């Protein structure tokens, strides 16, 4: 029925409502994860290819990938699976879930875009949106801006907006795994402590060995 189509490359998605057996006939009896032509659901969709990734049935139970049935089943879930979240550590619970074969009793599709066609379908293919968050580990910034050991990394981070009094202030994330001088004090302190312990053990052994007599 209700279709949710998303474009992974450009981070934009659009929804349409279809109530017709003929328009949705090609989707039937197809598992999740495989491609499917999208001509039949609209004139503008000629040459567009979509891919089934989810959806849930009339009562609202989600679709899961493993089960090879056309209807609802009943499993016991654990920490590492999909349609569950534990309340305690080590908790396991039995719930009812829907198969992965596409049938007439679905209430949503949740399918993504694969290939474009000959028209532009405004609001799904023309636009694009950025990351919404920039990296924080230093090496990631080095790889993002193609830098070297010489290029200081504290200058290449992006603040957002502030317009208090100055037009640009650019408050920036704290970046991690940076080579603070402190982390060198750690190395030298560890080395000196190890050397002191070695000296103490040598002195203790010599005193003991002379102590026997």
């Amino acid at each position: 029925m209700k279709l949710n189509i998303s474009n992974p490359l450009n981070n934009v998605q659009k929804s349409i409502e279809i109530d017709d057996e003929k328009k949705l006939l090609p989707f039937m009896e197809k598992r999740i994860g495989n491609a499917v032509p999208g001509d039949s659901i609209g004139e503008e969709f000629t040459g567009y290819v979509f891919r089934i990734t989810g959806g849930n049935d009339k009562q609202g139970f989600p679709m899961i990938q493993g089960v090879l049935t056309n209807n609802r089943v009943r499993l016991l879930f654990k920490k590492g699976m999909k349609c569950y979240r534990p309340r305690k550590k080590g908790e396991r619970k039995r719930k009812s879930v829907r198969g992965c074969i596409v049938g007439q009793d679905l209430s949503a599709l949740n399918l993504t875009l694969v290939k474009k066609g000959v028209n532009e379908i405004p609001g799904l293919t023309d636009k694009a949106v950025g990351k919404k968050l920039g990296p924080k580990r230093a090496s990631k910034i080095r790889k993002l801006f193609n830098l070297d050991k010489s290029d200081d990394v504290r200058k290449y981070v992006i603040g957002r907006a502030i317009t208090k009094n100055g037009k640009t202030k650019f408050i920036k994330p704290k970046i991690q795994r940076l080579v603070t001088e402190k982390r060198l004090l750690r190395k030298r302190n560890l080395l000196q402590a190890k050397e002191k312990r070695r000296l103490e053990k040598k002195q203790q052994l010599k005193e003991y060995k002379q102590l026997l007599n």
């Binding site: 203790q204 005193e207 003991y208 102590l211 026997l212």
Partner: protein, 257 residues
């Protein structure tokens, strides 16, 4: 569940703590550490019930937050830390020193030693172990490992330990003429010398002790603590010097106005 218990009820606490049987259903429940529960006292009890510095538990907490109380030359902030027999206590703010001892009853007291005496304590040896490289380690009543022990130290004598550095100063043997303090039933603060040793094979060894008033008492071996050679002790003692009179003459003395 049935795991380790965490609470202690008041009428089940050891009787030498002397806790009021009203005012509460619980006792401080000392932590795990160098001393056993029954042969020790928590720091809260010492610092509230005995010395009267604090009026509640929270005041003990606000005392210990500021780091001014040292046991065995190290600051502690645990309100239920075990404080044990021969342990020295320093309160920096008031410039005071103490050593816990038994009195002639079974109850612990702070003895108020001076500064020069505050630089050592006495530890009794519980066992001697041989480890890798044929190096010896001594285990004391204080829960303490001493490496490179002298070859002439056995598993029942006592040693004198420097506190600034964990090194050994000298040791005292466990003989027929040594001076002793007793640490369990029917005689808990008594000081005498030693008269004889028994050595029963499969069971306990019985030893006899003679007082300085020529009174004789005996106990087990495992509750004997050597504290000096034949002549003199190596620490100061409380007012009574471990001399236990009986009830008739104790009462007679107490009635001397």
């Amino acid at each position: 569940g049935k795991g380790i218990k965490k609470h202690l009820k008041r009428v089940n606490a050891p009787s030498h703590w002397m806790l009021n049987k009203m005012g509460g259903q619980y006792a401080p429940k000392t932590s795990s550490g160098p001393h056993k529960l029954l042969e020790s006292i928590p720091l809260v009890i010492l610092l509230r019930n005995r010395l009267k510095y604090a009026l509640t538990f929270d005041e003990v907490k606000m005392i210990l937050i500021q780091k001014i109380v040292k046991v065995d030359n190290k600051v502690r902030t645990d309100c239920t830390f075990p404080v044990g027999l021969m342990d020295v206590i320093h309160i920096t703010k008031s410039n005071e020193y103490f050593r816990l001892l038994y009195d002639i009853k079974g109850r612990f007291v702070p003895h108020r030693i001076t500064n020069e005496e505050s630089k050592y304590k006495l530890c009794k040896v519980k066992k001697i172990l041989l480890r890798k490289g044929r190096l010896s380690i001594a285990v004391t009543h204080d829960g303490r490992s001493i490496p490179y022990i002298h070859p002439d130290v056995k598993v029942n004598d006592t040693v004198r330990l420097d506190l600034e550095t964990g090194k050994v100063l000298e040791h005292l043997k466990f003989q027929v003429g040594s001076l002793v303090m007793v640490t369990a039933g029917h005689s808990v603060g008594r000081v005498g010398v030693i008269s004889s040793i028994d050595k029963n094979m499969g069971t306990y060894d019985i030893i006899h002790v003679k007082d300085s008033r020529n009174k004789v008492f005996a106990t087990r071996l495992s509750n004997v603590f050597v504290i000096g050679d034949n002549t003199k002790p190596y620490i100061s003692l409380p007012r009574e010097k471990g001399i236990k009179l009986d009830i008739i003459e104790e009462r007679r003395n107490r009635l001397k106005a």
